[PDB]
Amino acid sequence: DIRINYLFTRIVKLIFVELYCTHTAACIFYYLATTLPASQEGYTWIGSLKLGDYSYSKFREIDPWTRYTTSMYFAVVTMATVGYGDIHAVNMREMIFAMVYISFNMILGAYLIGNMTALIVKGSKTERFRDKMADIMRYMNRNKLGRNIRGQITGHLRLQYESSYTEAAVLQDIPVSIRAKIAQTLYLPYIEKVPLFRGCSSEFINQ
Amino acid sequence: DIRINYLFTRIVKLIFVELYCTHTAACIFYYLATTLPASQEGYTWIGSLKLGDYSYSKFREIDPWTRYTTSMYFAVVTMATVGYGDIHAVNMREMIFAMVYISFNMILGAYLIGNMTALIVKGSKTERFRDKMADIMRYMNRNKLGRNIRGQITGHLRLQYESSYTEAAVLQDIPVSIRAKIAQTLYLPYIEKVPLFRGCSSEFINQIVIRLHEEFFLPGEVIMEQGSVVDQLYFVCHGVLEEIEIVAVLQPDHSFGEISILCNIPQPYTVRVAELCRILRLDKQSFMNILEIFFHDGRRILNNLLEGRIKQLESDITFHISKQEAELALKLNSAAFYGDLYQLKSLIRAGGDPNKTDYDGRSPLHLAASRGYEDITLYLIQESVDVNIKDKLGSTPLLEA
Amino acid sequence: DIRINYLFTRIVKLIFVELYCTHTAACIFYYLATTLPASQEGYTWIGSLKLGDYSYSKFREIDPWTRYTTSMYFAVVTMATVGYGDIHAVNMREMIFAMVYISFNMILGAYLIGNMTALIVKGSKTERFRDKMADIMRYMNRNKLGRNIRGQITGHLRLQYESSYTEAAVLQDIPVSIRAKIAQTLYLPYIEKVPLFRGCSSEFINQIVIRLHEEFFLPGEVIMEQGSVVDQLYFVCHGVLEEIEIVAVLQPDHSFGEISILCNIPQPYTVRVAELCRILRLDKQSFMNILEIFFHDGRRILNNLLEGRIKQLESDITFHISKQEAELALKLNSAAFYGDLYQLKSLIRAGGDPNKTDYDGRSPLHLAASRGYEDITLYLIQESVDVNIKDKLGSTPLLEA
Amino acid sequence: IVHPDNRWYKAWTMFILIWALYSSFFTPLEFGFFRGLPENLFILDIAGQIAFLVDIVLTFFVAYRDSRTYRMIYKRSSIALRYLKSTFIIDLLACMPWDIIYKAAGEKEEVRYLLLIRLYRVHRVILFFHKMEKDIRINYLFTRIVKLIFVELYCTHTAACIFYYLATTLPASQEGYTWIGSLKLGDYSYSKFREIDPWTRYTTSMYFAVVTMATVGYGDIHAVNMREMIFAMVYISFNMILGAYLIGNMTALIVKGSKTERFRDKMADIMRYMNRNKLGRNIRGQITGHLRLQYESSYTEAAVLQDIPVSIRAKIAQTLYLPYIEKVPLFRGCSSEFINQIVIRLHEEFFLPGEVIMEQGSVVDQLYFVCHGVLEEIGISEEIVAVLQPDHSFGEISILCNIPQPYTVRVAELCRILRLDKQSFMNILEIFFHDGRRILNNLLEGKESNVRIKQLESDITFHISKQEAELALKLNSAAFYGDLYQLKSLIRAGGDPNKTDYDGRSPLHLAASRGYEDITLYLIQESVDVNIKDKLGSTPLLEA
């Protein structure tokens, strides 16, 4: 769709795919802790947790809210490759899942950087103006030619950038029927006033 | 290899490299722990490890499985630069290996990002459409076009993208002959069903298929205007086209616009699009060029043109085909009258028989001999033009000299 | 802005953005610690913090300095994804902010890499030299060139890179007039000192400066061969050149290669490079066109050519200038004899006076009238060519017809 | 004297790179892990500064090359002013002995901070990487990788020596607040933090610097003090700029692409188009195989042989193209200097099999020479009327008679074709009138097997007669001005003294016109017609 910003759409899609993967990993990390019976919950990544003075010893019937947001906090930190270390895998089954999840984020993390780099490298229509003038300036500085001649050429580039609207026009992948009508609406008023075309027929000036 | 994918063939290589390096580092790191004697195992990275209630108080004879997955877990975490810190180097020899292993991953890690970035730099099909649309929008909005014409331009550009009408950007690499078979694969069935080309030779038809172009039109558009000279030949391959109060409906497998191409008669009707239609177009210049080479093919098409309102048109075109033959001799004699040697060369190899005369009767030799153009006279000798041809006066080309 | 750098103007913006975000996050994170009452400060990220022997047992009234740098330290470590883990969220509300703050840095962190990458994509001066050298090396090695000629090609490309001889890639944007003043800034002092151009008009000299090109030559190279027709005019402005046993030494502020540019005499000497030399060259097409327009300027140069071995050459050029004047009439009359309309138009507007005759004496009107070319006679009357001119026979153009 | 680029000077420059490399790495160790200097290392400190002192007094006697005219200034005054305003101020401060000054003025730690000004001479090593990067014998990818490693190894080394220095600022009584005095990795104490050994105390600092530089952050070693927190934030912020720079260089090399990547990308787009229409089964093999040869048959395409002086391009062309020109049948009996002019402007092109060079009915503007492969001519069902072999030149018949191309030519096998423009072809013909008539003369003699020449025989016969008439005018003009030197050249190269121009004149008539006896007897010895007659009825003797 052309009514929606293209940069906005790409950013939101990357956020959603990153949010959904993190949400799924958080719900699976907590599931692995419940596989072990309550007798040996001390081996789990959460039953042995102690952040400040909070216990986390029971690990169950705490509440569905604080038990979920601590799992999501574990998934977000490892997904961004921060790795505080307060929450980490302790079991052998959790180590296997962590290695698979971490390896998955390297592919996904490089994909996120690739999209962001692609948009910037594509262009800005202003760095090209700076790059073109920078190369010319080095040539002028190398020869150390003139003082007021610099203003003549630097000012010249200002108008060249401004006076570029129909250059490299993409009005080529258009059917001849459509191009015929638009031409008669813009170019035609500038043709009948030419002194060379006095008394010319309508179909001749149309061709 | 072409059978396998390309992005798949390079994503797996990156995974394999990072998988093999972690496997090697995990095995080497565990070897450094066994270098120290068992008496002082508390100085190692694993002899002093304690995750939960597990103590690793022996670091040996545990099992080859849990003692390997904990070493692999330490290597994978370090490679991705997560660094939980539960497992870390404790010894001087382990610090040196960690410094070397970590420094190696920076070069490898940047290599992974570079390969992934280069795969995304190549723009997608919809990525170029948005860039193209903005450029068209900028130009057409600057000139302040009417809102009525804005929709047709924007609506048609969308249709080209979805239908992939162009689909011929990277096509010049085809060495004509390869492209020739492709063109007749998709366009020949529609051409052969055209009543206009009934009885045409098979070799002649294949010559024009390669030069066709495909495009689509939305309903409500107008292809040709009333009383406008048409320089494009179109063939209907899909949809319904209505010609303007309706008069005739352009059924599929039909052709139109040929009247203005040959007879120079301005188009007497307007074609209005009723539904989505697939149209094949041919440029004016090539069609005239091909007809010049195949004179015999044109005769068959001309005869079937009358067979293909209709009765009145058939009588009218008979008048036009007669005068165009005479018109060739008018400019042929004028070129010889003025002595323009180069101009005459165009009307001999791609025109008519110079031996024929105009309405009054004047062979080009008659004018050349009387006007004393000696140089051009040798050319008529090479063409074996009749020397004793007599006009409606009783004179001969020799007598004029 | 052009006064300030562009690399500097964009690196600072990236630093400022990451500096302001960390400052905001540090202040907001400390606010969440003060939300809880002082009775249960052990549940905060800082009330329970203990780094070394420092305990943070009060978390208040310590000082506004050490209590801010520890919050800023936690924010900067998190932003760079280092994550030591000494300071981390402990509360449910602090986890939510950490999740939001960390997720924000992923987009911002990738943005920093994108700007830095786009700055390095633009290749350096030496980056393109290596790419160019490989392409030249691959081509010349495929044809198996001799080792003697390998050094000259490779050595010369190095000289162009260091000296920046081309330095004119982005130069067509100059609107001629701006470029005109640039050319005379660096090339005029060497041209005015040329003995051959002594006495030339100032306006004429400025016309050829814009069309010059600059190049450098290594010692031991050969610019022109013995007995070879040359088509480039060179002006010495640096170094020493030797002309071939030595004969003469090309001192600076001299010019060579002009013998064949006008008299068509093949070059009788070979120029050998002795030391590094800067040479300005001019192409044949530009030199011929300017001379044709400025007929008066050419006369001054021709007169001073003799003044600028030398005595023998001065007598020889007098023989050649005489025949070229007569040679104009030979082809001038031949075109009129054959009645070539377009050929005759070339030698009148940019040639000589049609009224002059050849060695025997034959005005183009004499041949045209005798040969009976009626159309061409309408052109000679335009230039007011004399019609009573008599050759060395006693006849007139009227009598010939 | 002046030493611009002497081989001995180039040895001195490489000699001082060793000192620059040594003093760049040893300075952080001297600042952080040392208080003063032991007598063992006193010799190296003195010897190092004297070596750089020589360089300061020697760079005033070294010429520098001009940045505008490339003129090698060689001037005493210009050399000194350039060096004084660029680096002399900072290069002299480093050479000053900051160790003996520190010990002589009691024991001031503030004056020892100036010892870090010697970290500037690492710029010598950076210039070395740039110097060898321009060399073509060394791999370009290898140079870039090594430079990135060195620029990161040096930064990590300096940070490790400053992290340990911050721990020694606090007195030994309160060492527990430092990042290292409170360390405990396994069962190791690290409590004393001093007199442990210089080796394990350094490698634990380097291990701290490497882990934080790569953004791993284990957390076993971290800042504990307020002064160490400030340094950590500055160092961490510095690595973000440097870390993104490292990724940028690696991405730039990969984004530049490879030849196989371009081949794969081009074929991938075509394959999607073919699969979209689901056209053909064996058609894919025809086109996929076609791209295989196109990738291989691309060696001189987009050649960079343009930024080369005309003198160099002249010799290389004569060493490759020339052995393929004199063998052309069209150039039989041509002079050496005429065949030299054409070979300068020749262009080389490669055509894949199946391509079409020229189409029937098109205007011809390029002259083509065949050197490799075979060519096929088509005209009319398609009929093959002629097959072109190597050493043959095609396109000359339609370039002299000004006719359109009558037989389109396709490519049947991989061919190497030399191309020359029509505009410059006529210019060489006009200059070389003597050799210009032989090209069409040899062409005319080929009217035995070819049929296109037979129908064009009349036009060719006109041109050879028209050109011959120009010879008579030039030959007659030679005798008018009494220049026998040019007359000899005009007659040996096929010139006929018994040549009559349009107006009845003869060279004998012009010989007697000015009473030149020397030119006269030459014509008689050449069997000239003394009684030759003109329409004016003027005998040569009567005109005399």
Residue numbers in the entry:
A (entry chain D): 208 to 414
B (entry chain A), C (entry chain C): 208 to 451, 460 to 523, 529 to 621
D (entry chain B): 74 to 453, 458 to 621
Can you provide the manuscript's text about this entry?
Among these channels, the Stelar K+ outward rectifier channel (SKOR) functions as a K+ efflux channel for long-distance distribution of K+ from roots to the upper parts of the plant. Interestingly, SKOR contains an intracellular ankyrin repeat (ANK) domain, which is absent in all the depolarization-activated K+ channels with known structure. Each protomer can be arbitrarily divided into four layers along the central axis: a transmembrane domain (TMD) comprising six transmembrane α-helices designated as S1–S6, a gating ring formed by the C-linker, a cytoplasmic domain homologous with the cyclic nucleotide-binding domain (CNBD), and an ANK domain. Unlike the canonical potassium channel, SKOR does not adopt a C4 but a C2 symmetry, which occurs in the C-linker, CNBD and ANK domain.
Besides the wild-type SKOR, we also determined the structure of an SKOR mutant L271P-D312N (SKORmut), which was reported to convert outwardly rectifying SKOR into an inward rectifier, at a resolution of 3.1 Å. Structural comparison of SKORwt1 and SKORmut showed that the pore domains of these two structures are almost identical, indicating that SKORmut is also in a closed state.
